PDB file of C-alpha atoms and ligand atoms in Angstrom:
ATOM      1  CA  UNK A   1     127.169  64.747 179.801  1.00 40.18           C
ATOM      2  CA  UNK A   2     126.890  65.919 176.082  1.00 39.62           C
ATOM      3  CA  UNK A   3     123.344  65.691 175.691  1.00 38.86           C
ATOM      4  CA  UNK A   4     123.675  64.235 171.607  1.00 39.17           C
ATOM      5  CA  UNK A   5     125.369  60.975 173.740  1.00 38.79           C
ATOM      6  CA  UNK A   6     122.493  60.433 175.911  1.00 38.83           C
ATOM      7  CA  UNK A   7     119.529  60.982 173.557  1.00 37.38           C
ATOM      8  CA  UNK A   8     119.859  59.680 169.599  1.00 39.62           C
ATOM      9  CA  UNK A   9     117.342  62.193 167.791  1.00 44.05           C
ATOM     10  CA  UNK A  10     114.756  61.283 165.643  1.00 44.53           C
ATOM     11  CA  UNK A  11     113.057  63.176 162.748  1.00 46.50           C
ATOM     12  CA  UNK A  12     111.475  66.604 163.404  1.00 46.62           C
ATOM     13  CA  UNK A  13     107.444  66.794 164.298  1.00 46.13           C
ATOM     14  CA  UNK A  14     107.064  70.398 164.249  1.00 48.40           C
ATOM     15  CA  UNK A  15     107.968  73.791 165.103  1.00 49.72           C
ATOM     16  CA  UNK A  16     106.760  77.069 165.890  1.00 50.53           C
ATOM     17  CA  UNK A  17     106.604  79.865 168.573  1.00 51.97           C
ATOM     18  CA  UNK A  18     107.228  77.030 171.053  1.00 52.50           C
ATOM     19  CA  UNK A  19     110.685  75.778 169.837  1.00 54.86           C
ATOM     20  CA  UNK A  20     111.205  73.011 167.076  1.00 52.86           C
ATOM     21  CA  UNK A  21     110.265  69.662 168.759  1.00 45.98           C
ATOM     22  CA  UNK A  22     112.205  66.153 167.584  1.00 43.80           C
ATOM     23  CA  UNK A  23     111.439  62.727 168.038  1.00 47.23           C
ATOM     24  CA  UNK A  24     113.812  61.004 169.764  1.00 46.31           C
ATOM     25  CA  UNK A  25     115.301  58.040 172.480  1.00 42.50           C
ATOM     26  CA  UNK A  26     116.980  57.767 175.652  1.00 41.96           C
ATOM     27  CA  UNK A  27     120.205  55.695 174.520  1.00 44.57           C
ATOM     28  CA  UNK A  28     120.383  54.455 178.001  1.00 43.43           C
ATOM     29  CA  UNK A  29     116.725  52.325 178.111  1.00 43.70           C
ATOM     30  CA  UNK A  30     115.349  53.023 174.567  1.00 41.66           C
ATOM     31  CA  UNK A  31     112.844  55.446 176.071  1.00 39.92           C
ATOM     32  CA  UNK A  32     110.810  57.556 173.831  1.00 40.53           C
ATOM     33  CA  UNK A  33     111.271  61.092 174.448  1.00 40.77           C
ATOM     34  CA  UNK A  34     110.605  64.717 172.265  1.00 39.36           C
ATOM     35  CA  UNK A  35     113.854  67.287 172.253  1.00 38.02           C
ATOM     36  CA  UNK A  36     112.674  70.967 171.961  1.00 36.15           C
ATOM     37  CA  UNK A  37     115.108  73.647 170.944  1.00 40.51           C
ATOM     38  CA  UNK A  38     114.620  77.129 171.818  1.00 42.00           C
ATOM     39  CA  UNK A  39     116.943  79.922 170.543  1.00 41.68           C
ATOM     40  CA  UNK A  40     117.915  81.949 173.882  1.00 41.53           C
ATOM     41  CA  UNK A  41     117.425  85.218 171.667  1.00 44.43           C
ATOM     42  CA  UNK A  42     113.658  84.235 171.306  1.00 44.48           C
ATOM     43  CA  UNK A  43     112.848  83.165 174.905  1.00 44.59           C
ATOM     44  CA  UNK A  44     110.294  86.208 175.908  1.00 47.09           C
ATOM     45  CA  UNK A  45     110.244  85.271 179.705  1.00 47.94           C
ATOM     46  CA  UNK A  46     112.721  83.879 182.449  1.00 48.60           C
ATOM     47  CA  UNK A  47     112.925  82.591 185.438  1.00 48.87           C
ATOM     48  CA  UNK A  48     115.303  81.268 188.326  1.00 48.51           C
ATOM     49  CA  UNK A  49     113.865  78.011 190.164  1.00 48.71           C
ATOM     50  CA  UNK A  50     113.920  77.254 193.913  1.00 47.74           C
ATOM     51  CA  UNK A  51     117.542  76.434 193.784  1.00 47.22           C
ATOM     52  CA  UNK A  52     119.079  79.355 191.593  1.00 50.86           C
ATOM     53  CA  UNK A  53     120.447  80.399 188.123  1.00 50.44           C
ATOM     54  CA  UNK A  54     118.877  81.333 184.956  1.00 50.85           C
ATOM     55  CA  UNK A  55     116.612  78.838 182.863  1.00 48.91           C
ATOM     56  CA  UNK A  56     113.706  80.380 180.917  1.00 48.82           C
ATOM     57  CA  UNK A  57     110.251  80.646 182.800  1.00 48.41           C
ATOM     58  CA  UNK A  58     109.371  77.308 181.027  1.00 48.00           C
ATOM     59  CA  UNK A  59     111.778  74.772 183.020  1.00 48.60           C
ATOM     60  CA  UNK A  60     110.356  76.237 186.451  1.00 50.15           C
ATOM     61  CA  UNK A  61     106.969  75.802 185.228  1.00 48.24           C
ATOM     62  CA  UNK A  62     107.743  72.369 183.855  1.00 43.85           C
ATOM     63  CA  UNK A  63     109.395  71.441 186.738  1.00 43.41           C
ATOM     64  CA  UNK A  64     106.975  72.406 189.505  1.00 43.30           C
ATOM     65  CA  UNK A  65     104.116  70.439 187.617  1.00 46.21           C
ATOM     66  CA  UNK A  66     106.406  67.118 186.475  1.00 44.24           C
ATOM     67  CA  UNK A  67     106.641  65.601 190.282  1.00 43.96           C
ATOM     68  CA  UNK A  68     104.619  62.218 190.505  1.00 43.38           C
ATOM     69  CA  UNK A  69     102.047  60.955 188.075  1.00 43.86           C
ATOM     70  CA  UNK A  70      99.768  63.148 185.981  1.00 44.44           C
ATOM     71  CA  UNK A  71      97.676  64.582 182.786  1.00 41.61           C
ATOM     72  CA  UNK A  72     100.728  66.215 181.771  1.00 44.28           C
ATOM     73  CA  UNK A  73     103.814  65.635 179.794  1.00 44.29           C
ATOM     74  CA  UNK A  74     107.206  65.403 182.577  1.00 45.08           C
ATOM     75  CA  UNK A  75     110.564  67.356 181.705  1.00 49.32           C
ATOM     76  CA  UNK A  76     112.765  64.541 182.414  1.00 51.15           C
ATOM     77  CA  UNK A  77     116.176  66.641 181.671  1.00 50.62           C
ATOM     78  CA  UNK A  78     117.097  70.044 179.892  1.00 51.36           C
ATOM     79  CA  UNK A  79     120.698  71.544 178.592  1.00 50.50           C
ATOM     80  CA  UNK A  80     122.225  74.951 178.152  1.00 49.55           C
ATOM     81  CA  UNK A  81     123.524  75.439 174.999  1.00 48.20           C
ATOM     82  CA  UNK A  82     125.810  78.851 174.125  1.00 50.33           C
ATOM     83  CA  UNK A  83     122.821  80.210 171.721  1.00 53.00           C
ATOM     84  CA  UNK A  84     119.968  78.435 173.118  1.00 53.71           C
ATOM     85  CA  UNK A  85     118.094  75.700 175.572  1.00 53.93           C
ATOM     86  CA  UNK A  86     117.069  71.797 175.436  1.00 54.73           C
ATOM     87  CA  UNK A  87     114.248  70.173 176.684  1.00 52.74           C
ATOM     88  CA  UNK A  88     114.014  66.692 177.062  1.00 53.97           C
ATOM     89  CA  UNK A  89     110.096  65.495 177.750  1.00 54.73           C
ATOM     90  CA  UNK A  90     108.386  62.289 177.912  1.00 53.10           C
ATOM     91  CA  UNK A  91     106.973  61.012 174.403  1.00 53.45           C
ATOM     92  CA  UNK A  92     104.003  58.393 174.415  1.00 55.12           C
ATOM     93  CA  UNK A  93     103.739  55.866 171.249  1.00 55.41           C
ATOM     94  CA  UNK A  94     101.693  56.075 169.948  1.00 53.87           C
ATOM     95  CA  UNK A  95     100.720  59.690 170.222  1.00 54.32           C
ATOM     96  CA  UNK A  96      97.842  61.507 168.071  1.00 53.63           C
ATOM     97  CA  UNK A  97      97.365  65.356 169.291  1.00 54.84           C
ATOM     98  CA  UNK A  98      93.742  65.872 169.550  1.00 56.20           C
ATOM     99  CA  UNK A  99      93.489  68.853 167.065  1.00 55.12           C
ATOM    100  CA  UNK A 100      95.128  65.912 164.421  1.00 54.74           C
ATOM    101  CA  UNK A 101      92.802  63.595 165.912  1.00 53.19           C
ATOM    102  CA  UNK A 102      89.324  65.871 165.940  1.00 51.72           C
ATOM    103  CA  UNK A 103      90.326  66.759 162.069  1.00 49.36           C
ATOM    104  CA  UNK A 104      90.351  63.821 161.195  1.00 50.84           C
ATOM    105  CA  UNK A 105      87.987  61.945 163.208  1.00 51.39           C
ATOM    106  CA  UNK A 106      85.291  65.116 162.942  1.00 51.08           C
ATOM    107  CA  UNK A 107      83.253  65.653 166.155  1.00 48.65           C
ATOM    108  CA  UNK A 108      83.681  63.122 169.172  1.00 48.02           C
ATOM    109  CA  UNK A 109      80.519  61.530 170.680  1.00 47.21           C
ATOM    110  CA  UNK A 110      79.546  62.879 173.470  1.00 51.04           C
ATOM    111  CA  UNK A 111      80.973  59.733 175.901  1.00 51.14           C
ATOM    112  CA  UNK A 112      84.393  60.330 174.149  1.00 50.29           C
ATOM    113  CA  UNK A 113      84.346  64.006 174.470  1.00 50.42           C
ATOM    114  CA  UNK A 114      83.236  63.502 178.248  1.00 53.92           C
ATOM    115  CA  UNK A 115      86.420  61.076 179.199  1.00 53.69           C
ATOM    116  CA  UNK A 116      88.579  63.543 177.390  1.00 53.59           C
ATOM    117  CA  UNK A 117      87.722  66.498 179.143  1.00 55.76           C
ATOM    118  CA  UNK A 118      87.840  64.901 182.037  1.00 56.78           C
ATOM    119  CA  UNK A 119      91.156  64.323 182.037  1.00 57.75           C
ATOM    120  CA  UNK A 120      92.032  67.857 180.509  1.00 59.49           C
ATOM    121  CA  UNK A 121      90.666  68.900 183.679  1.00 59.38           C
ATOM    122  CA  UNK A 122      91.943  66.839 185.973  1.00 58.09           C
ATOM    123  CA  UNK A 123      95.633  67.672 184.289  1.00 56.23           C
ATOM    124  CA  UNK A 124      94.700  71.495 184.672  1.00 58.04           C
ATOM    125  CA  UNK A 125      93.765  71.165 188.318  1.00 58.53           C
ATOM    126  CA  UNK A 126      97.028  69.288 188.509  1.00 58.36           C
ATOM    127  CA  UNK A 127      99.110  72.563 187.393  1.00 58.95           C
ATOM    128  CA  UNK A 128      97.025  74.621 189.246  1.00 57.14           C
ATOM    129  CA  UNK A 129      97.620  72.630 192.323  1.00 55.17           C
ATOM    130  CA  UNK A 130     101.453  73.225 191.679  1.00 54.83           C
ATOM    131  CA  UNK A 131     100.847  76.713 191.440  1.00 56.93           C
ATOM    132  CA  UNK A 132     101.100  76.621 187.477  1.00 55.61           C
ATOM    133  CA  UNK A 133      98.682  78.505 184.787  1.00 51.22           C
ATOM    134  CA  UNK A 134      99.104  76.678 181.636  1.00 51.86           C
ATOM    135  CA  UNK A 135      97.556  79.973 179.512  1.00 55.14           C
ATOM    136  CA  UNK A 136      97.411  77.984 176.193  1.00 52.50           C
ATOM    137  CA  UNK A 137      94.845  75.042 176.919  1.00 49.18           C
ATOM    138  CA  UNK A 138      94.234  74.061 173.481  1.00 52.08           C
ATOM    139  CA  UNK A 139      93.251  70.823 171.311  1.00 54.86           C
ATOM    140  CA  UNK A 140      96.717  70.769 169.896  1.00 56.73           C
ATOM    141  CA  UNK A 141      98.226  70.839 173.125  1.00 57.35           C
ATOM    142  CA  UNK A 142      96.534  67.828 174.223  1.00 61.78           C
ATOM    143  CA  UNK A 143      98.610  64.645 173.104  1.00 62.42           C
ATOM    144  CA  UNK A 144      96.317  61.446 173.109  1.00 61.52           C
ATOM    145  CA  UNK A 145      97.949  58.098 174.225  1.00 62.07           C
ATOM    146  CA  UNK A 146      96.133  55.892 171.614  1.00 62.82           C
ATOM    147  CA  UNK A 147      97.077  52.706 173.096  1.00 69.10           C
ATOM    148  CA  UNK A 148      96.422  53.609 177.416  1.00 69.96           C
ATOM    149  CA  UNK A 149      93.663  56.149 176.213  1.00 70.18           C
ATOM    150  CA  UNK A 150      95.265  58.893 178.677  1.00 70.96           C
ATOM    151  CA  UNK A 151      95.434  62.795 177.470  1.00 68.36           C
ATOM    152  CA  UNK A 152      98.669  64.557 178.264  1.00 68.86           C
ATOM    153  CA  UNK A 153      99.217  68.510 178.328  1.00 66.99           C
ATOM    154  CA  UNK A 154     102.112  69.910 176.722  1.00 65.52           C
ATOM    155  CA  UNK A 155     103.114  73.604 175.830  1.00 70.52           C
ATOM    156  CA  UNK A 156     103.701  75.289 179.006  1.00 67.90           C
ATOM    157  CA  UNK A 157     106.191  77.424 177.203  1.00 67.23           C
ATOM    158  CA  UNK A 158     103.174  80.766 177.343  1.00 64.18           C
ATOM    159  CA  UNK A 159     102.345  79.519 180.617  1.00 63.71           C
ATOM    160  CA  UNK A 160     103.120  81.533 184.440  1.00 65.53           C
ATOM    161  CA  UNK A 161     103.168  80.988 188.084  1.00 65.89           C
ATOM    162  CA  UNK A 162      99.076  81.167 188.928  1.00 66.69           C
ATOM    163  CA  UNK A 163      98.359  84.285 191.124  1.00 67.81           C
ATOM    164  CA  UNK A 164      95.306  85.767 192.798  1.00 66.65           C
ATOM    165  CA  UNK A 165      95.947  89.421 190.736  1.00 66.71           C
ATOM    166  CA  UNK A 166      95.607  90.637 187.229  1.00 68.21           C
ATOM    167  CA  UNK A 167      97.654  89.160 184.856  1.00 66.00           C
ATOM    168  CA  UNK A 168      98.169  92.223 181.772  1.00 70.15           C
ATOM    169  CA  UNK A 169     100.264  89.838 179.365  1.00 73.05           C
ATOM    170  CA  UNK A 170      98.981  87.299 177.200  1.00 71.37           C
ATOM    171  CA  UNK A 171     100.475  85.226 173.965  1.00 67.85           C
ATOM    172  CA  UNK A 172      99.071  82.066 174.003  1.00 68.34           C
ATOM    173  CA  UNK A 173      96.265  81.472 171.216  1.00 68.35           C
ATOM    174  CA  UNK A 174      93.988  84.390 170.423  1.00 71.92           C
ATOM    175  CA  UNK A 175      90.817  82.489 169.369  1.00 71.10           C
ATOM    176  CA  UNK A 176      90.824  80.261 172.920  1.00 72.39           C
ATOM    177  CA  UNK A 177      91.432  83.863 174.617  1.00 75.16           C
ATOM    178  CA  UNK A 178      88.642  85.509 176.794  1.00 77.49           C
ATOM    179  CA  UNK A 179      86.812  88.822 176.271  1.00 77.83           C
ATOM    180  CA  UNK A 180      88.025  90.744 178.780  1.00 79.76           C
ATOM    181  CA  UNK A 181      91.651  89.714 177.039  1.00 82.25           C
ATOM    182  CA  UNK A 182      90.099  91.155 173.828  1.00 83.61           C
ATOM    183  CA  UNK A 183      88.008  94.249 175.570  1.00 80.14           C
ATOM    184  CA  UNK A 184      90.892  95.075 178.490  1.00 82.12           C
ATOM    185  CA  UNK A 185      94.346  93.351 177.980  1.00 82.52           C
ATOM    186  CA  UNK A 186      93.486  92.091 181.883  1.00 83.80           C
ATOM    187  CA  UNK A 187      92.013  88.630 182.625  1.00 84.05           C
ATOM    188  CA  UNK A 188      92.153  86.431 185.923  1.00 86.17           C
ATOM    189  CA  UNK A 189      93.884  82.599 185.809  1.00 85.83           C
ATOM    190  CA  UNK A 190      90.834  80.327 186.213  1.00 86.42           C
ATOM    191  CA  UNK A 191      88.459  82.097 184.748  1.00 87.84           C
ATOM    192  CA  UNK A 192      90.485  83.238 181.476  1.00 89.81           C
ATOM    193  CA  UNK A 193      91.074  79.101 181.804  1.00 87.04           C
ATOM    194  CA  UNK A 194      87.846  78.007 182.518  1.00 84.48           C
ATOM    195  CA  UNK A 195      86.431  80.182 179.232  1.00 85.63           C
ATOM    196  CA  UNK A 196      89.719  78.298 176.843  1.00 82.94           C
ATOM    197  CA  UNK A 197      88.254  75.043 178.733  1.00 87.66           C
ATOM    198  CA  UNK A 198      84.774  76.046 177.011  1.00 89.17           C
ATOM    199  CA  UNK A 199      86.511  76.687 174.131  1.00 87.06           C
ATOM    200  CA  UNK A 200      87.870  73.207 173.470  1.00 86.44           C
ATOM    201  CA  UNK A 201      84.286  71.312 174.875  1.00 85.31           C
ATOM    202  CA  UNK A 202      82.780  73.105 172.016  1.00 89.01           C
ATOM    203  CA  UNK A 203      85.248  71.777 169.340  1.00 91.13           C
ATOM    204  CA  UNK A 204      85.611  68.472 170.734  1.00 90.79           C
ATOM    205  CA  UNK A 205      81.485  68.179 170.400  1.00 93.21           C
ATOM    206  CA  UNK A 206      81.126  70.448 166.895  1.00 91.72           C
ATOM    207  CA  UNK A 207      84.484  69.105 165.403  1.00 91.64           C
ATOM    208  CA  UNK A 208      85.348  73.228 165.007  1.00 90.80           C
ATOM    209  CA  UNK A 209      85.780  76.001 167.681  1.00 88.93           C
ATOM    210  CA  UNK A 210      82.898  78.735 168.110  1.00 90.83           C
ATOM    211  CA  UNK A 211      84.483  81.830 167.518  1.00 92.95           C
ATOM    212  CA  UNK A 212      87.167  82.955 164.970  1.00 92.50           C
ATOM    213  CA  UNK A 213      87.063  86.622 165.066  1.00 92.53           C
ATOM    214  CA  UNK A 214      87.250  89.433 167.677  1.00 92.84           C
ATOM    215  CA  UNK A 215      83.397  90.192 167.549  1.00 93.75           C
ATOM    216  CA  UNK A 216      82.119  86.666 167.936  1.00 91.97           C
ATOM    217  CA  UNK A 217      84.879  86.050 171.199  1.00 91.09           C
ATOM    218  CA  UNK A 218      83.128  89.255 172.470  1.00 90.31           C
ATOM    219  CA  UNK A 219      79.453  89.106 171.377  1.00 92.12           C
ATOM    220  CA  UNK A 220      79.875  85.376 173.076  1.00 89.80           C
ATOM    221  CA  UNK A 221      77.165  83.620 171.415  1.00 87.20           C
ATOM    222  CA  UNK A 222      77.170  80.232 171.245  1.00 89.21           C
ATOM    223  CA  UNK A 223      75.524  78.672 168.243  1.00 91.89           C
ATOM    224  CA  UNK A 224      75.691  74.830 167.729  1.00 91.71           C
ATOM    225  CA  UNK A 225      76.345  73.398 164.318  1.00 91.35           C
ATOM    226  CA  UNK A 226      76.231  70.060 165.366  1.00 91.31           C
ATOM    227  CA  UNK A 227      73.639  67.883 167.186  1.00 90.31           C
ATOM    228  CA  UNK A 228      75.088  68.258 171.198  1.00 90.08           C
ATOM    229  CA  UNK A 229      73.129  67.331 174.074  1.00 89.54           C
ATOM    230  CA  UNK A 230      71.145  70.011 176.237  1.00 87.83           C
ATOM    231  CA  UNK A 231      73.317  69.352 179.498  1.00 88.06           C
ATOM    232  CA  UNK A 232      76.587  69.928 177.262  1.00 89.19           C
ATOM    233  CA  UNK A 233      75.112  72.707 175.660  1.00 88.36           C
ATOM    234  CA  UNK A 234      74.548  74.293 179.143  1.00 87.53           C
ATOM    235  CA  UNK A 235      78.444  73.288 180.583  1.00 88.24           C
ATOM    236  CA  UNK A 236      79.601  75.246 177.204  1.00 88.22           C
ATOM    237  CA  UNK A 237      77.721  77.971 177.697  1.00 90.76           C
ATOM    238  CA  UNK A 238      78.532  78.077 181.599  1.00 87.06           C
ATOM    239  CA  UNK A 239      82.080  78.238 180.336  1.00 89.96           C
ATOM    240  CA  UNK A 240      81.566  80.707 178.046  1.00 92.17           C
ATOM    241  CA  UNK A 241      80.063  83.381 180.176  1.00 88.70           C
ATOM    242  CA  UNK A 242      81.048  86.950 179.170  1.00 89.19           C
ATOM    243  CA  UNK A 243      81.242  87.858 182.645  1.00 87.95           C
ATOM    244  CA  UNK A 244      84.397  85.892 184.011  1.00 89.40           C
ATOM    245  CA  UNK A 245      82.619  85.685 187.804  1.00 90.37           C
ATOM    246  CA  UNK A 246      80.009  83.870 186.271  1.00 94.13           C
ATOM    247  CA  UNK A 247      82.081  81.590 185.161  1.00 95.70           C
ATOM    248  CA  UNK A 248      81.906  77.975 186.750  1.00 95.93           C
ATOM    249  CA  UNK A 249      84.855  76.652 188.816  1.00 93.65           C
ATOM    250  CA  UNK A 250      86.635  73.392 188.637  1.00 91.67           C
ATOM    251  CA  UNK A 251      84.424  72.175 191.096  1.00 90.71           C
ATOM    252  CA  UNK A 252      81.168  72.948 189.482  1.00 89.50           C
ATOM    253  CA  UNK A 253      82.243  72.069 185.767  1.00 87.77           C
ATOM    254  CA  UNK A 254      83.669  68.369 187.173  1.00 88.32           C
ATOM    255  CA  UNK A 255      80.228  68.479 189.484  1.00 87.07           C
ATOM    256  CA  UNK A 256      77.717  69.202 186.294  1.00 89.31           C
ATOM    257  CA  UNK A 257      75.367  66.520 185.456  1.00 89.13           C
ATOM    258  CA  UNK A 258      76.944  66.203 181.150  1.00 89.70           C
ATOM    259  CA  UNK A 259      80.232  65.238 183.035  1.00 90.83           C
ATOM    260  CA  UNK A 260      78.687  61.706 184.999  1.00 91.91           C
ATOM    261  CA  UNK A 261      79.712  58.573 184.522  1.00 93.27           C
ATOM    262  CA  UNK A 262      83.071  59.405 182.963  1.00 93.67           C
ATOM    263  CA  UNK A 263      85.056  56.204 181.734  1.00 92.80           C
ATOM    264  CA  UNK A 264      87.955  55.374 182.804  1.00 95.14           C
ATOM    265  CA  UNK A 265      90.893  55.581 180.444  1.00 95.67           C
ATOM    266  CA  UNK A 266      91.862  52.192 179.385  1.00 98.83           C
ATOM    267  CA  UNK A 267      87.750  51.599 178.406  1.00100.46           C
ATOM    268  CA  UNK A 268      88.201  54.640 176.817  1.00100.85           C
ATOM    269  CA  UNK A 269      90.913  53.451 174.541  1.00 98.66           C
ATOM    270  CA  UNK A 270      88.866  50.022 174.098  1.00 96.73           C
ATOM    271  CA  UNK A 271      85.817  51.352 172.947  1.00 93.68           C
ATOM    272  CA  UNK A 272      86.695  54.756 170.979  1.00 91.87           C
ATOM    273  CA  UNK A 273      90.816  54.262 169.686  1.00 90.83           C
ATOM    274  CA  UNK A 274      91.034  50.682 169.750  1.00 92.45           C
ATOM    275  CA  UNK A 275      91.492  50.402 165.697  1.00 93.13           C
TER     276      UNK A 275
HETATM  277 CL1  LIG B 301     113.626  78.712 168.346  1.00 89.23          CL
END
């Protein structure tokens, strides 16, 4: 009941608009874990969860998608500090984030890519499910366990409850945001998701996303610089529909003939990250 008792902290592995994140180990069992600081004077958003005081947005999010077994990374414990907050969060080992891993693997065969985003959206329908929009679905937000071949979300800190109305706010990344984000500043949750979920197919096959500037995310076209499949081609360019109705849903994306035959995680591991 200091928090520096429980958990001995490990170097740092990064930092940004999220926090800065350190490796680190419950004292109690030797469990790996990652400790994310936020200042209090940079938290954007807030919130007050079922039970009632003030924790930023990012706890009640965390905490309404961390019950049971998932695709995503569990808060296991957070702290109030005077000047800021403390997340504690479930670490796997070993852990390769898949923008790390597509850098410097290049593009994933298609099976690989397949078993991947499979998973990415089983963990979204997960949040969604729990009444949770992630908002910055990303390669670099997906943590690979190398060893059990499972994908794990993390990053909710840009994320909101998922509602049926506009949302007019946005600051997760802007090159995995949706036209009508760039044209309007107004975008719905699954189908501004759905589009980010296109986003990351196409760099997991091509090894780089499609789009890096304001006209290309709203001219939409999708040009392939790698060799990709027709059927994969077609669920990309599903996803990337500049009309967000025409957009696929879960359903129909996890119901598309490219994503058959997934394998399971462990064979995943075996035959891709085993090495
Ligand atoms: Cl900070």
């Amino acid at each position: 009941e200091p928090l520096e008792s429980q958990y001995q902290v490990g170097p740092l592995l990064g930092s940004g608009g999220f926090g800065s994140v350190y490796s680190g180990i419950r004292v109690s069992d030797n469990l790996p874990v990652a400790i994310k600081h936020v200042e209090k004077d940079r938290i954007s958003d807030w919130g007050e969860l079922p039970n009632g005081t003030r924790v930023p947005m990012e706890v009640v999010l965390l905490k309404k998608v961390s019950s049971g077994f998932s695709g995503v990374i569990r808060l296991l414990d957070w702290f109030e500090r005077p000047d800021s907050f403390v997340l504690i969060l479930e670490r796997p080992e070993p852990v390769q984030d898949l923008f790390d891993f597509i850098t410097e693997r290049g593009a994933l065969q298609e099976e690989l890519a397949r078993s991947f985003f499979w998973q990415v959206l089983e963990a979204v329908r997960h949040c969604h499910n729990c009444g949770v929009l992630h908002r910055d679905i990303k390669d670099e937000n997906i943590l690979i366990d190398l060893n059990r071949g499972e994908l794990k979300l993390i990053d909710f800190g840009s994320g909101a409850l998922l509602k049926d109305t506009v949302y007019t706010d946005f600051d997760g990344t802007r090159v995995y945001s949706p036209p009508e984000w760039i044209r309007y500043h107004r975008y719905h949750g699954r189908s501004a998701a759905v589009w980010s979920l296109g986003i990351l197919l196409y760099d997991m096959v091509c090894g780089d996303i499609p789009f890096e500037h304001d006209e290309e995310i709203i001219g939409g076209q999708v040009f392939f610089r790698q060799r990709v499949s027709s059927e994969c081609q077609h669920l990309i360019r599903w996803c990337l529909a500049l009309r967000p109705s025409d957009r696929p849903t879960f359903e129909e994306i996890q119901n598309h003939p490219w994503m058959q035959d997934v394998l399971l995680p462990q064979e995943t591991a075996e035959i891709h990250l085993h090495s």
